[PDB]
Design a protein around this ligand. Structure first.
Ligand SMILES: Nc1nc2c(ncn2[C@@H]2O[C@H](COP(=O)(O)CP(=O)(O)OP(=O)(O)O)[C@@H](O)[C@H]2O)c(=O)[nH]1
Ligand SMILES: Nc1nc2c(ncn2[C@@H]2O[C@H](COP(=O)(O)CP(=O)(O)OP(=O)(O)O)[C@@H](O)[C@H]2O)c(=O)[nH]1
Ligand SMILES: Nc1nc2c(ncn2[C@@H]2O[C@H](COP(=O)(O)OP(=O)(O)OP(=O)(O)O)[C@@H](O)[C@H]2O)c(=O)[nH]1
Ligand SMILES: Nc1nc2c(ncn2[C@@H]2O[C@H](COP(=O)(O)OP(=O)(O)OP(=O)(O)O)[C@@H](O)[C@H]2O)c(=O)[nH]1
Ligand SMILES: [Mg+2]
Ligand SMILES: [Mg+2]
Ligand SMILES: [Mg+2]
Ligand SMILES: [Mg+2]
Lengths: 427, 430, 430, 427
């Protein structure tokens, strides 16, 4: 019933997906072995959105574990809550994309996409009423970026009316891990522009900034960053998984945040995020959730919202809260900050409220915002790509296995066009 | 006889219906499981032996909102045939609720309404509950009212709405749906009552001194208003108002069928002790701007017809005195072509109090329904929001992406322009 | 019928109102929670069954004393909407209390006054309690009184004010506010009763031999004065004085409406036994310059009209004897154009004593309210202080920065000057 | 409801503010952990004026602790009642002003002050109806004087209609801690002339003299001085925090004590103050409180009021007291000493009475006096500054930090104008 098929591509995608399944099984009371041990009956009527019924009161996720390096799935299986997954959903090659969009899209991605599509076909036909897919991947590598773009495209010709949801970690100028990040990022955006219904631009720089200044976390590993991303992923589907005063599925957020089809790159966030020592001094009400989730430091992208205009924002509230307070806080945000919101769209905020909060907290909010500050996040990638492309740097790799200069040119042109249209609608 | 069928579509309609049915079960003595440990025939039909099933229907395009009802306290009041769930939500799309999702659920609700209407012998009409901002409550309500008008016809169709507020709004595409639904609500609704969430919140803040009111208090007030409307059918009094005479008194012109509801006295428990809740003072409180259930100032509008539905310990002479005092107030204005503009009904049954509710027990209560021109500026500001979002063609690709056309939006906008012109030319003096 | 509404503005007004309402509840037997285990209809409205709410209103721009009332022993007497509270105090600023802070709270208090005035059918007038020194009690009192004048019109307006003492005062910017509030009280008031705190202090020190009296004793004395004012209307007597008759007999000219109130006998318990308190001697003590509650000298003034309000075991013949003896005394002189200048009122019921009060139980009591020219000297030194402070333009910016100009400072100055000229030219012999 | 935001600048400001928060939590019955353990409801009916309701039925101060050395921050946190403050309000740098008003107002304090503005902004927006701000700072250093002056300018720019309070300790010629005190004092007093609604001139001479001759304390440390200043700060706002026969908020004192906008420098005072050995030999009555207030020795600025004329005098009384005898005492004070009060203002003394006395005393009084004797406190500072200015002494630090000599020249001109206006209103 409104099922979601989850796909994880690349090492980053698989890590974030494993943490997401950790937090989801925590929400629904599913043990490390996959059997129900929750207390509330509300954890089971919407168990089919992410899980399948196995023999013997056992729940298996609707997850596809995709990568070219078998070590990633070895790690995922060996970790905690890792045996819950279906053994044959794990799909793997032997080589590895080698930080190459070209090999992740043409030469060793293609032989694996057949098996991946077979698995997702089985999962989609098994489910009762599909509503869409979720893909977690990063734009820096070749497996994540390249093969996830290919997979998204294939799903789009096979399921064009279902919603395409992706959670994409984009590269950042400060946190740069591989040398060919601009190429992979540009080539991946060239297909996420027209093949996805909503894209949540994650980045490591903003996550580290959260773990520094907001959480006051001394040594943030990837576990904490993936925990934040998993919290946002759970927030965007809480309304699907639980009842509430206002209910908003993925399609409702998509229709309320995509005025024009190409502007579906959203800046996610979460609230409350508190330090261990500072959470004891903080009042916990709707206004403080509102002020946290609208704060530029809290945002999960390396672009200041104050440098642009909010086309639309979403506030997927959770927990037992008053609707007057929520709507009034959204009203005050819209009024006292009229310069930061687009004038030709009155009521820029989409508000949803669920009643089941995340474990350990009595209320939480997931900020989603379609702002014009994505233009600079894409201009950084565009200028890095242009710098590496005038001198033909590293092009011999991508050209070595089928790609050509015109594909890079068209990817850059598409990214420039999207930046220009964000600038146009910013005014 | 004198049965009425309540249709609850959309999340708002279903929740308001939950409130209404809790209120009615409290009023008539029906337990939540359907046993009474007469006058309930208006809304409840006795089935078999000691079982009353309400003449309701709960339709939504998502399962969950119906699902807490199917597993809640009133799971045995209903049976799963008037609780209807779809597969996918309309997603704040009038187009999805009207064309793509509505088409495969309209037949089932239609024949459920058929089996619920052929059972009763004195059907006065229908009560449809929804919002204008929601995709379901706009599109599927439009489709359902099309079907009801083409099937039943002369039968009355009372409509309850949650109008979008000037400022308190939760959907970005809300003006689009609100403009689209009225293009059929105009010619398919005999009477359309408006309720605005911002006004109800402000009322709860001042009168009911609740700092943090949720949707449940809003639905409690709406259910109280609906109960006050239907008490004439469900009980007896000195002056009784049927739905037909209600429409005859309240609707001057076929396009002008959008009255404003209000309730009095809406007070807390501690405020009730120190208040002299006389007929005159609640009659006055009905007309003052701050207790209007829709955010609009009646001062710069002019009234056409007011339906005063008194209930409780009320005698007609003080009602006439209160109306006489109202007629002498310069601040309240009436159109010249309506020398008398008060249809009055008095009912003996006092308004009951839901356990755990914020409303205090009162001897008397008034639900005044005024058809006024004060809704014209609300519609004008809705049109301003609509053409602001429409000058840039924003969000239109979602609606036209399923089978709607641009001509639908253009014709809805010109229909609202004509309707605003109609109020302007009917409020003018002669 | 025959009702009157009490308005309490400022800290002084609110505390005096607390004392007045405690005294009234003691008088009519109403407990602090409103239950009485007729004649109380003047000041109390009976709500439902066994619940009396005072016909009062409490207004402040600061929440200290109002919330003290809301948590005091009389918290059940007043409903919350009766006690109106601001956020930021006027802070001893006429500008703040009249223009900046008073504009956003005047509408709500006027609405409360309207809802309190239509409830009663025989509204005699209003009793406004305030002080000249305070920013709220000057500015907002002037604003409320002009709004009441433009709204109600011919309804009587009686106000009780704490005029600053020549030497005993607690505000530096006091003369500005005192001049400004009188500039509008001259035309928006029907009878302004004047009280000096220093004179209350002198009476407490001499008559009641209290070495350390505080504001509660002052408010108790003022409450006794107001109770003696309203006793002729809340009870029955041999000679009854109504508010309209009071104004007609006491006010000879429209601008001359500032009488001086005296109350007698005001003595301690130990001093009461040795005194045979007859009507003649308390009448004589009323005219004693040491017993006036305004720090002024009646000897250098000239009486124009005095109203004698008697309560207790009083018969008219001894009152006539006392008045005849008063006429024969040369030290007390009257204007030539008023051959008879005594308004006499006798009430049977004696003045009650508040438990814990300093006053002693007396069989008889007199509250004389004389309109005399002795207050011309009070206006004279207030004006001298105003001029002496205004020469250097001190504190003027603290008013100019809040929607106010020096031109109206000068116009209030010349209006006061015309007032002393009026008193001087009505005090001359013909 | 008329809440006050507290700010501490510099080491002295931080210590005075910490002592003030300790004594005001004792007054309101707040334990060092932040929870309420009082006995009367009057301790909570005005708890929002200084404290923010945190989750868990406990309170945190509306205070922002500002310095340029983390050492003072650590000292404040580590001491008693130091845990109550919210950790994010602790705003500090790493370099320190180094007794340089330039480093505190133009380069390093300017770099840091954006965070301070952000914190005070969120504090002012979280609260309901803000009435003003109060700042505790020195004038001899560079952190306190310079950076608090910058903060005052920014706050006045952002909140022009709110009241400014500055319990500022001024340098004195005999107990002169540093060499550059007059430079810092003149530069600070420049902007304190116009950017502050009212200023309380305190100095260590009068505090030491109180601790010598009044308290008869053999070796008073900074703690007793800070306790005295804290008691005066609490007695200023006791009318806001508690009911009374006659209430007087800070705005009322401002309008009753500032006849002209530039004359808002007051000498604070507190009564009663008795030694331990003389506690039983002294009578508990109001006339002796009045005598203790109005004598020269109890003043907390090193200015003898007998050398000047009182413009306006405030007396915030506390405890169950009679009004007649208070007014009589003030009348006798104004009559026997008509030569020491300005003649063109009748009723030079404003009286306010609160019912709740300070802990351990059944009666107390706070003296706030606006007198022309303040002018000599600026004469000494101006002559010390002029002595060092003719020879360009120590100016090279400020000049190299970014200032210019003309700034010093115009600050001196401003102080000379203030002195002249005080003299010509003294007559
Ligand atoms: N937020 C997170 N970022 C991660 C995580 N693991 C890796 N990364 C980041 O992802 C970026 C590159 O993505 P991956 O290393 O997963 C590359 P992928 O396996 O998708 O492709 P190939 O390795 O080229 O086959 C790089 O900046 C990493 O630091 C993780 O758990 N969380
Ligand atoms: N009354 C008090 N005076 C103090 C206290 N601490 C210091 N002082 C005095 O204040 C003056 C210097 O103030 P500070 O040391 O706080 C200077 P600040 O830290 O604001 O500037 P920098 O030293 O340039 O960082 C000097 O006369 C000190 O003796 C205190 O707790 N109380
Ligand atoms: N008064 C009141 N209004 C509600 C309630 N629930 C939803 N609404 C209003 O309904 C509007 C949107 O329609 P919804 O009811 O939320 O959704 P729907 O009618 O099911 O249609 P969909 O958008 O397809 O879900 C919002 O603007 C709310 O103001 C409620 O419980 N009480
Ligand atoms: N007789 C008497 N006079 C009082 C009492 N309380 C205050 N006053 C007088 O009121 C004057 C100041 O006005 P307040 O009532 O205190 O204050 P306000 O009217 O609210 O105006 P603000 O100053 O803006 O607060 C003082 O000069 C007092 O003489 C009281 O209890 N009894
Ligand atoms: Mg990889
Ligand atoms: Mg819905
Ligand atoms: Mg006051
Ligand atoms: Mg320092």
């Amino acid at each position: 019933m409104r099922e979601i098929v989850h796909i994880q591509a690349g090492q980053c995608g698989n890590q974030i997906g494993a943490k997401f399944w950790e937090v989801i099984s925590d929400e629904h009371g599913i043990d490390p072995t996959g059997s129900y041990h929750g207390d509330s009956d509300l954890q089971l009527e919407r168990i089919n959105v992410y899980y399948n019924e196995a023999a013997g009161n056992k729940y298996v996720p609707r997850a596809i574990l995709v990568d070219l390096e078998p070590g990633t799935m070895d790690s995922v299986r060996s970790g905690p809550f890792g045996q819950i997954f279906r053994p044959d959903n794990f799909v793997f090659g032997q080589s590895g994309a080698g930080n190459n969009w070209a090999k992740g899209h043409y030469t060793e991605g293609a032989e694996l996409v057949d098996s991946v599509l077979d698995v997702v076909r089985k999962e989609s036909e098994s489910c009762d009423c599909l509503q869409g897919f979720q893909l977690t991947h990063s734009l820096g590598g070749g497996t994540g970026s390249g093969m996830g773009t290919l997979l998204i495209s294939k799903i789009r010709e096979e399921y064009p009316d279902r919603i395409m949801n992706t959670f994409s970690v984009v590269p950042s100028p400060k946190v740069s891990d591989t040398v060919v990040e601009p190429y992979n990022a540009t080539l991946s955006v060239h297909q996420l522009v027209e093949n996805t219904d909503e894209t949540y631009c994650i980045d490591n720089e903003a996550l580290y900034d959260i773990c520094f200044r907001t959480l006051k976390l001394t040594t943030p590993t990837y576990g904490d960053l993936n925990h934040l991303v998993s919290a946002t992923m759970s927030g965007v589907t809480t309304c699907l998984r639980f009842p509430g005063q206002l209910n908003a599925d993925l399609r409702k957020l998509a229709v309320n945040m995509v005025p024009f089809p190409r502007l579906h790159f959203f800046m996610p966030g979460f609230a409350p995020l508190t330090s261990r020592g500072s959470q004891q001094y903080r009042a916990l009400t709707v206004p403080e959730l509102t002020q946290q989730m609208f704060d530029a430091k809290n945002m999960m992208a390396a672009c200041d919202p104050r440098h642009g205009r909010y086309l639309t924002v979403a506030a997927v509230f959770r927990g037992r809260m008053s609707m007057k307070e929520v709507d009034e806080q959204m009203l005050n945000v819209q009024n006292k900050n009229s310069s930061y919101f687009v004038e030709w769209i009155p009521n820029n905020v989409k508000t949803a409220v669920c009643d089941i909060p995340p474990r350990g907290l009595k209320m939480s909010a997931t900020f989603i915002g379609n702002s014009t500050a994505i233009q600079e996040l894409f201009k950084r990638i565009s200028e890095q790509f242009t710098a590496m492309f005038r001198r033909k740097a590293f092009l011999h790799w991508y050209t070595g296995e089928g790609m050509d200069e015109m594909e890079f040119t068209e990817a850059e042109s598409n990214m420039n066009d999207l930046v220009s249209e964000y600038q146009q609608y910013q005014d | 006889m004198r049965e009425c069928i309540s249709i609850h579509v959309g999340q708002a309609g279903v929740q308001i219906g939950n409130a209404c049915w809790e209120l009615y079960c409290l009023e008539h003595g029906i337990q939540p499981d359907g046993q009474m440990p007469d006058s309930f025939n208006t809304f409840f039909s006795e089935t078999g032996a000691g079982k009353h099933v309400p003449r309701a229907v709960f339709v939504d395009l998502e399962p969950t909102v119906i699902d807490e009802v199917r597993t809640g306290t009133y799971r045995q009041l209903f049976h799963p045939e008037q609780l209807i769930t779809g597969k996918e939500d309309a997603a704040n799309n009038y187009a999805r609720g009207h064309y793509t999702i509505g088409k495969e659920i309209i037949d089932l609700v239609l024949d459920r309404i058929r089996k619920l209407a052929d059972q009763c012998t004195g059907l006065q009409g229908f009560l449809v509950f929804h919002s204008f901002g929601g995709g379901t409550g706009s599109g599927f309500t439009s489709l359902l009212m099309e079907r009801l008008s083409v099937d039943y016809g002369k039968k009355s169709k009372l409509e309850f709405s949650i109008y979008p507020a000037p400022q308190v709004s939760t959907a970005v595409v809300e003006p689009y749906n609100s403009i689209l639904t009225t293009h059929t609500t105009l010619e398919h609704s005999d009477c359309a009552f408006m309720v605005d969430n911002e006004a109800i919140y402000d009322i709860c803040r001042r009168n009911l001194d609740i700092e943090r009111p949720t949707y449940t208090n809003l639905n409690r007030l709406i259910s109280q208003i609906v109960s006050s409307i239907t008490a004439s059918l469900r009980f007896d009094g000195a002056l009784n108002v049927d739905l037909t005479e209600f429409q005859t008194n309240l609707v001057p012109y076929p396009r002008i069928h959008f009255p404003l509801a209000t309730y009095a006295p809406v007070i807390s428990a501690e405020k009730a002790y120190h208040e002299q809740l006389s007929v005159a003072e609640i009659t006055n409180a009905c007309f003052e701007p701050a207790n209007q259930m829709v955010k609009c100032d009646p001062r710069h509008g002019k009234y056409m017809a007011c339906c005063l539905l008194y209930r409780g310990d009320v005698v007609p002479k003080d009602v006439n005195a209160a109306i006489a005092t109202i007629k002498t107030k310069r601040s309240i204005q009436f159109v010249d072509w309506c020398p008398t503009g008060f249809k009055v009904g008095i009912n003996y049954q006092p308004p009951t109090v839901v356990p755990g509710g914020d409303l205090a027990k009162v001897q008397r209560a008034v639900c005044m329904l005024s058809n006024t021109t004060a809704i014209a500026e609300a519609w004008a500001r809705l049109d301003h929001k609509f053409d602001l979002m429409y000058a840039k063609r924003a969000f239109v690709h979602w609606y036209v992406g399923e089978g709607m056309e641009e001509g639908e939006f253009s014709e809805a906008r010109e229909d609202m322009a004509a309707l605003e012109k109609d109020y302007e030319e009917v409020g003018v003096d002669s």
